[PDB]
Design a protein around this ligand. Sequence first.
Ligand SMILES: CCC1=C(C)/C(=C/C2=NC(=C\c3[nH]c(/C=C4\NC(=O)[C@H](C)[C@H]4CC)c(C)c3CCC(=O)O)/C(CCC(=O)O)=C2C)NC1=O
Ligand SMILES: CCC1=C(C)/C(=C/C2=NC(=C\c3[nH]c(/C=C4\NC(=O)[C@H](C)[C@H]4CC)c(C)c3CCC(=O)O)/C(CCC(=O)O)=C2C)NC1=O
Ligand SMILES: CCC1=C(C)/C(=C/C2=NC(=C\c3[nH]c(/C=C4\NC(=O)[C@H](C)[C@H]4CC)c(C)c3CCC(=O)O)/C(CCC(=O)O)=C2C)NC1=O
Ligand SMILES: CCC1=C(C)/C(=C/C2=NC(=C\c3[nH]c(/C=C4\NC(=O)[C@H](C)[C@H]4CC)c(C)c3CCC(=O)O)/C(CCC(=O)O)=C2C)NC1=O
Ligand SMILES: CCC1=C(C)/C(=C/C2=NC(=C\c3[nH]c(/C=C4\NC(=O)[C@H](C)[C@H]4CC)c(C)c3CCC(=O)O)/C(CCC(=O)O)=C2C)NC1=O
Ligand SMILES: CCC1=C(C)/C(=C/C2=NC(=C\c3[nH]c(/C=C4\NC(=O)[C@H](C)[C@H]4CC)c(C)c3CCC(=O)O)/C(CCC(=O)O)=C2C)NC1=O
Ligand SMILES: CCC1=C(C)/C(=C/C2=NC(=C\c3[nH]c(/C=C4\NC(=O)[C@H](C)[C@H]4CC)c(C)c3CCC(=O)O)/C(CCC(=O)O)=C2C)NC1=O
Ligand SMILES: CCC1=C(C)/C(=C/C2=NC(=C\c3[nH]c(/C=C4\NC(=O)[C@H](C)[C@H]4CC)c(C)c3CCC(=O)O)/C(CCC(=O)O)=C2C)NC1=O
Ligand SMILES: CCC1=C(C)/C(=C/C2=NC(=C\c3[nH]c(/C=C4\NC(=O)[C@H](C)[C@H]4CC)c(C)c3CCC(=O)O)/C(CCC(=O)O)=C2C)NC1=O
Ligand SMILES: CCC1=C(C)/C(=C/C2=NC(=C\c3[nH]c(/C=C4\NC(=O)[C@H](C)[C@H]4CC)c(C)c3CCC(=O)O)/C(CCC(=O)O)=C2C)NC1=O
Ligand SMILES: CCC1=C(C)/C(=C/C2=NC(=C\c3[nH]c(/C=C4\NC(=O)[C@H](C)[C@H]4CC)c(C)c3CCC(=O)O)/C(CCC(=O)O)=C2C)NC1=O
Lengths: 162, 162, 162, 162, 60, 241, 172, 172, 172
Amino acid sequence: SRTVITEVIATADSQGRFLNSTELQAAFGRFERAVPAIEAARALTKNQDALVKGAVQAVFKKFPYVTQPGEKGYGDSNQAKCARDIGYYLRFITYSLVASGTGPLDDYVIAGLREVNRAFNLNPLWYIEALNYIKGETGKLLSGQSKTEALLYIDHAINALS
Amino acid sequence: SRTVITEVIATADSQGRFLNSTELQAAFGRFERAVPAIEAARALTKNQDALVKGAVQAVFKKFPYVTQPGEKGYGDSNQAKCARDIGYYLRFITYSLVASGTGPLDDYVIAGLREVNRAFNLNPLWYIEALNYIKGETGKLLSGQSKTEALLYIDHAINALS
Amino acid sequence: SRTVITEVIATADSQGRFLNSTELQAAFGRFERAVPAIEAARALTKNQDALVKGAVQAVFKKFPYVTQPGEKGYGDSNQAKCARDIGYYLRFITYSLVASGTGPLDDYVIAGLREVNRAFNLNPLWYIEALNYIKGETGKLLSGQSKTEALLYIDHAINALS
Amino acid sequence: SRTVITEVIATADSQGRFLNSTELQAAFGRFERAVPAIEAARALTKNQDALVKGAVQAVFKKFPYVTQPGEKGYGDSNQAKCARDIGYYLRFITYSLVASGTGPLDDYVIAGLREVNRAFNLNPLWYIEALNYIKGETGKLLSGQSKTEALLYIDHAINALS
Amino acid sequence: RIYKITVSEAGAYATNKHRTGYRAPIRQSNYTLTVPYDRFLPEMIRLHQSGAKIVNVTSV
Amino acid sequence: FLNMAKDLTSVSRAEWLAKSYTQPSRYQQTETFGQERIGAVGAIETPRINLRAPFTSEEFQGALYAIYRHIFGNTYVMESERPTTAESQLKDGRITVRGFIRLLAKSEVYKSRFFQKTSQNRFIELSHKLLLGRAPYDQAEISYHLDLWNTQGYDAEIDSYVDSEEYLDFFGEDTVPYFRGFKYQTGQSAEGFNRLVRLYDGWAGSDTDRNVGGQVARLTANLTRGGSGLEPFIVMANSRR
Amino acid sequence: MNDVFTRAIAQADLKGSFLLESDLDKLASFAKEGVKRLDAVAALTNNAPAIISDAAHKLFAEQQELIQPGGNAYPHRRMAACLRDMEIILRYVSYALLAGDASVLDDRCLNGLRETYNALGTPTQSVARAVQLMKDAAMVHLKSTANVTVGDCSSLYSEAATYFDKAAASIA
Amino acid sequence: MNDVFTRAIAQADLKGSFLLESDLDKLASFAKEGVKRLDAVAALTNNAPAIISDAAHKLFAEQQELIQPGGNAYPHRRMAACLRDMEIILRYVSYALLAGDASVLDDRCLNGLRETYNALGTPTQSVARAVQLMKDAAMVHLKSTANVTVGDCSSLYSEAATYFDKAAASIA
Amino acid sequence: MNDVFTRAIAQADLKGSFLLESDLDKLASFAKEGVKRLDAVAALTNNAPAIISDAAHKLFAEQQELIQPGGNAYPHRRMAACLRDMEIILRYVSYALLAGDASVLDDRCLNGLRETYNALGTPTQSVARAVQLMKDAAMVHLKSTANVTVGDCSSLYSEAATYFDKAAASIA
Ligand SMILES: CCC1=C(C)/C(=C/C2=NC(=C\c3[nH]c(/C=C4\NC(=O)[C@H](C)[C@H]4CC)c(C)c3CCC(=O)O)/C(CCC(=O)O)=C2C)NC1=O
Ligand SMILES: CCC1=C(C)/C(=C/C2=NC(=C\c3[nH]c(/C=C4\NC(=O)[C@H](C)[C@H]4CC)c(C)c3CCC(=O)O)/C(CCC(=O)O)=C2C)NC1=O
Ligand SMILES: CCC1=C(C)/C(=C/C2=NC(=C\c3[nH]c(/C=C4\NC(=O)[C@H](C)[C@H]4CC)c(C)c3CCC(=O)O)/C(CCC(=O)O)=C2C)NC1=O
Ligand SMILES: CCC1=C(C)/C(=C/C2=NC(=C\c3[nH]c(/C=C4\NC(=O)[C@H](C)[C@H]4CC)c(C)c3CCC(=O)O)/C(CCC(=O)O)=C2C)NC1=O
Ligand SMILES: CCC1=C(C)/C(=C/C2=NC(=C\c3[nH]c(/C=C4\NC(=O)[C@H](C)[C@H]4CC)c(C)c3CCC(=O)O)/C(CCC(=O)O)=C2C)NC1=O
Ligand SMILES: CCC1=C(C)/C(=C/C2=NC(=C\c3[nH]c(/C=C4\NC(=O)[C@H](C)[C@H]4CC)c(C)c3CCC(=O)O)/C(CCC(=O)O)=C2C)NC1=O
Ligand SMILES: CCC1=C(C)/C(=C/C2=NC(=C\c3[nH]c(/C=C4\NC(=O)[C@H](C)[C@H]4CC)c(C)c3CCC(=O)O)/C(CCC(=O)O)=C2C)NC1=O
Ligand SMILES: CCC1=C(C)/C(=C/C2=NC(=C\c3[nH]c(/C=C4\NC(=O)[C@H](C)[C@H]4CC)c(C)c3CCC(=O)O)/C(CCC(=O)O)=C2C)NC1=O
Ligand SMILES: CCC1=C(C)/C(=C/C2=NC(=C\c3[nH]c(/C=C4\NC(=O)[C@H](C)[C@H]4CC)c(C)c3CCC(=O)O)/C(CCC(=O)O)=C2C)NC1=O
Ligand SMILES: CCC1=C(C)/C(=C/C2=NC(=C\c3[nH]c(/C=C4\NC(=O)[C@H](C)[C@H]4CC)c(C)c3CCC(=O)O)/C(CCC(=O)O)=C2C)NC1=O
Ligand SMILES: CCC1=C(C)/C(=C/C2=NC(=C\c3[nH]c(/C=C4\NC(=O)[C@H](C)[C@H]4CC)c(C)c3CCC(=O)O)/C(CCC(=O)O)=C2C)NC1=O
């Protein structure tokens, strides 16, 4: 996964050279930023259920029509899959927070996203609404830097969806 | 030159993507570590004259035969060139400290070092001894992390020599 | 190894064509130059021990400091390795004389020479002095075309070192 | 072999796409004009004996010098394999007619034609004459679309022989 | 002998690359390619197949 | 049964399905699973080196390292064998990365490692691997390249690879060649993946001519046959037994 | 690549003979039914997204084990590769249906697919099941009469079934 | 490649689970103790020529047959390749030490190394001995207490030893 | 690639020694007879089309099954491949004659040729027969007294025969 340490190692390895001061300072920045990111991930994990339920209902609020019979948001299975997908997004965002890089989101959600959504007729706007929700509440669940890392990762996912 | 910021932006450009958390954290580490590096730069610049003369004396102590006639170090012109080269190394170490990267050393010293030294029959052990003296005297008048940075850059230069 | 015959055959092979008059003429010149070259090789084989001892003593004469304690010429093992290395160079020079091409020297000595002398901190100038001594002595062992063949291979090795 | 169906399928495969409208309508045209082509194939199969004997004699008339002793056409075996080669040419023209593509002519005759003729010293003008006689006959044997279909392949073979 | 070709693209290459998609990172249109005589024939027709346009061919 | 009935009816269907969806699979397969099996994680995830006309010393030296690692098959090239004039021409902008690759593959390094002590089958599969980042897709490629070298020579045969539409569409004058055939390519023959796997020897493998047996071909029978020859019997086995 | 015409020509050349009149009759019959064959191929082409989506839905409902965390179609890129493979195989079945011969499907698509899947760790039984589900979904659009003149095409349906079965049995 | 964090994340994904509190505590400990890891990596990097030279001297002092005519480091080219190998392995051990994970040794440094040596004919026992000697010569520079704040780095020494031993055991 | 000189040198290097006086005498005799060797190589090169043509004519007169439909040289592409192969083998026999060593013949031509022919369905007995017939035609041309100085060249004749025999044995 593309993280600070991993890109450091990969760039040094592609040039066949040891780890120098530049890369060690990048690693130092990662190790220092770990504390805000890890406790932001802690906060996001502790509140996963409320976040996911609020996100699903926010999607149903901004897209009322999907709830009606005959289209995507109708049925117990479809809404369980909505909840599962939003939980997937939250899970990989917390993963990226912990790993200090967009790696987990890049490799698990963003690689192959458009093809899969197109094949299954899934609107990226639903997930954008859910992630804007999660963004809004992660604003008040987090303070200081932790809010900052959480929102960089959430906005990275949103940008990937658009 | 290869700094933290330049490596960040080059990696981001190579994928054709914006600058994100996995790059901003590296830049943050650079900005955190800037203060010891600049302090070490001041310390190395203020003591440059004594450092250079002592390094030349260390070279002539470790390799006495060089001073004998018919050898490289005989003559005032050769010894002036010795002082000039040690000053070059010290100056570019200060540059590398300031830029928080091996870029100044790589671009101005390391690139072409071996061929240039071989052509003019310059022994890299002379410069290794001078840099070892500079490392020893950097053990004084530098404290804590600034000394760590200076020693890392000097060790980069030494590793490139050998 | 790269000889006259081998370069001829490899040229015709990479071109997908039979050997023509030009390559037969190159081969003819090789087969003629063989008589002086084999005579030179036999002369250098007879006097290999004297040449090695003389080259080692010339190395110690031109670099009196190496034999001092704490440097690479001190100890019986180090000087034995000196004699071994001079023997290697002489043996591969006679190989290149027999083969009518620099192939033995390029393959067995020159390929990797710089990395190895750099790793083990061997000065190329020691070997250059030894080869210059051997050049002078073969100036007295040989004459005519044998002399120029041996000298050409010897100072091919010399330019390889420098 | 390269025929219309094969061309359209291979083009669709190289682009990783399904067979679009143009390829299907081209296949439709191939299927429609199979009837004239199969008619020509059956006609030229029925009259293979007269066509082959006439082509052989036409070659002998236009090249009267090939028959005298010491020449390529002298002998019963050379006669027989003249007939055999012209039979091959007619067989592959019928194959191309059936396939509605020059692929059989390309693969079983044209690919390797010059090298083989040069190796065995066979004048392509001989077979140009024989195919020209067959071209003169097919105008008598065939009508409408069938005549043109066979003429295309005979002209293709004559062009290849040039 | 070697000749220098000045290459430009004004829509044909753009249309082709929009159909096919951006497969290696995008680059500026105008550039100069030096070609020996032996490969002078293919490269130019290659530049014609890619829809590229040439403005000057110099013999040096 | 009582626990099953409490899990079935006592609770609403929505969370029941929700948690059933996120249960772990019996396939315990990470995202890198499958790439790790074939040994191609690094060869897939390494950066694509693109070298423009203006560049710095670090970018230039790193691009040189990548070029020598790929184009010479992870084989050691000593300091004496490195082409200085070609590096200078590339540094000035006289030749592109493509022209540098063309010069390198025409060099005695490449020839001595991949041409001179080999059969033409080995040279052809190896040039496909090194210059196109993919394996030969059929026997027609083998016949085409053997004929081309036999009638025109080594340089024409190298120009066939470097002037190919494939090379320009994927590498195109500025990017170092990389291994393309670990991902599905359009037009691929479903065996080119297996053939690139059989050509690839991991990240620490090389295409040296210094192996004990020598430099020998790998894909001759698979290419000429077009497969393993067990597929008809696989179709039989997928019936009754 | 081999279609019915090239296959007949290859046999005739092996014998060393001109095509017999019965062979010409079979080839003329093939050309006559070519328009119906083209209609079948267009039915497979135009309805490809529907077929793939239907077969994917039924496959992932049948064995949810594949889309769960750890499954082989779990992450977006592996699910995308799954859909891509189904697209590829359906494309090759359409090629084989137009040609009238399974040589293209066997040569370009099936010889190495199974050990590709084994190397990757893909479950080959599930891939074969997906191909069977595409068969079932494709026959529906293959028999659709809208915008097409009514007629009998049972031979075409049998041939397409044998191509899908060839694919499934080669993969499994 | 993986670091410790991505390895924990990958092991958590197979469970469909968020990272646990104990896992987050372990990763917080890893990062909080990261400055010592950086010092250790700098120690390996800055003394790499010394490590390789010391190990090479000892290796060719114990095993003279490697540098005899017929030995596998005999000519300059084979010796040069030997030194390249030692430098590469040490570089990758430093990568692994920075990452806190051995995934970069498995995926890159040792991916096909045993097979390389086996095909070349290289005695893998001598290669493992070279790696052991590099471990012995690298522990000294890791344990050097000069120029660094004093502290307990026994875990870093053990981890580096495991990386060196992993390389040695994968060779032989 | 090797010649007699490089082969002797490689053996001496394995022994770790200088070339002995007997070896130097052998190589001196080789270089002395090199002019005759060049005559033999030119005899092979100048008369190559005649050699291949005669071998092909005799081969296809002996084995008519090779040029019939179903034969391994039936169409022009297969016959051209046959003749191309014959020229390639003759050309590597000429290279080996010049070098005085068969290393290039083994490494380039006969490297995996038996397996290539087996996988192609090429009858290797017939390839060996073709190589024998080229050997005969060549032996006629190398023994020609015209345009040379009469002398004893039986060693060259035997060496060329060994090269042809080694080619035919490697193939079959
Ligand atoms: C690890 C990363 C990952 C993601 C993100 C992912 C999303 C995903 N959701 C799916 C199904 C679905 N997802 C939804 C989501 C909708 N439900 C409605 O209530 C909402 C409006 C909306 C969500 C905001 C629906 C309706 C389906 C069923 C689509 C169908 O089968 O027709 C599918 C198809 C496979 C299946 O049927 O289970 C995928 C691939 N899969 C992954 O492996
Ligand atoms: C399937 C495609 C195919 C073609 C077209 C073909 C032509 C062909 N004809 C041949 C023989 C021959 N063919 C001819 C030509 C005829 N003889 C004369 O009566 C006429 C002037 C002349 C016809 C116009 C001759 C003279 C030979 C004998 C050459 C020899 O001595 O080898 C040979 C050499 C092998 C042999 O049969 O001995 C080939 C390859 N072979 C093929 O496999
Ligand atoms: C280093 C980064 C970089 C840039 C920026 C760049 C610009 C660039 N713009 C192009 C085309 C284009 N660029 C534009 C955009 C302009 N026209 C619109 O009206 C707008 C006013 C305006 C954008 C705000 C358009 C419309 C084209 C298509 C022109 C055509 O096809 O005729 C092309 C040619 C694409 C091809 O031939 O396939 C390039 C190379 N190239 C680079 O390598
Ligand atoms: C990309 C499209 C294209 C172009 C632009 C083209 C023209 C063209 N003509 C060329 C040479 C040539 N062209 C000719 C033409 C003849 N000269 C006179 O005798 C005749 C009146 C005339 C016949 C019409 C000649 C003689 C040469 C050789 C020039 C030389 O080598 O000095 C070359 C260089 C061939 C090479 O170096 O490989 C090109 C590119 N051909 C193409 O396919
Ligand atoms: C540079 C060293 C080298 C050689 C010589 C070599 C031989 C070689 N011969 C081949 C084919 C062939 N080779 C032959 C030759 C046979 N035909 C008759 O049966 C004869 C008994 C016999 C020759 C006297 C034929 C007919 C083919 C066509 C393959 C086929 O049957 O489809 C092929 C496959 C590619 C192609 O079809 O052109 C190779 C690689 N490969 C090498 O790397
Ligand atoms: C031209 C003919 C051809 C085909 C068909 C082909 C298939 C093919 N499928 C692949 C991966 C894959 N294929 C699948 C699909 C399977 N796994 C799912 O669970 C389903 C059960 C099932 C689909 C119904 C998956 C999931 C992968 C990714 C496996 C991995 O990356 O580890 C790959 C590896 C390259 C890549 O990932 O892009 C190939 C080459 N290759 C070819 O050259
Ligand atoms: C645009 C590309 C193109 C296509 C697709 C094409 C096919 C095509 N099929 C036709 C008739 C037909 N089409 C079919 C096939 C049908 N039988 C069943 O009802 C099925 C629903 C279906 C196939 C499974 C049949 C049986 C006929 C009548 C028989 C015939 O006309 O030969 C016709 C009308 C011609 C006529 O009967 O006078 C066309 C144009 N032609 C083209 O140029
Ligand atoms: C076949 C080609 C070949 C050559 C040429 C070669 C040279 C060579 N000499 C060496 C030893 C040595 N060689 C010397 C040099 C001599 N000793 C001193 O008495 C003199 C000042 C000096 C005169 C030139 C020294 C000092 C060593 C010891 C290396 C050390 O311990 O660091 C070594 C290090 C490996 C070992 O321990 O033996 C090499 C590689 N090796 C080869 O395989
Ligand atoms: C993943 C990173 C990576 C590694 C690790 C790597 C190892 C590696 N070492 C090689 C050769 C070699 N390696 C050695 C080293 C051995 N000699 C013995 O004396 C020693 C005990 C031992 C080393 C400590 C030697 C001597 C060769 C040359 C073999 C030869 O020339 O025949 C080769 C083949 C390249 C060539 O021979 O030119 C590789 C691939 N390559 C890589 O890209
Ligand atoms: C530019 C690259 C870079 C490096 C190298 C770096 C190292 C570094 N070493 C530090 C102190 C330290 N360094 C060490 C490590 C040493 N202690 C023992 O002597 C061991 C022998 C040895 C490690 C193997 C220890 C234990 C500390 C104490 C700080 C702590 O444990 O929290 C600190 C924190 C200052 C403090 O609070 O004391 C840093 C940031 N930082 C960087 O940005
Ligand atoms: C242009 C390239 C080139 C060639 C071709 C060449 C050949 C060559 N052949 C020579 C004589 C000779 N050539 C031969 C060989 C022939 N006699 C036997 O009858 C055989 C039929 C046949 C060899 C198979 C012999 C025996 C001599 C006499 C020289 C001697 O015996 O030492 C000579 C010495 C001058 C002379 O006596 O006429 C040369 C230079 N030299 C070259 O630079």
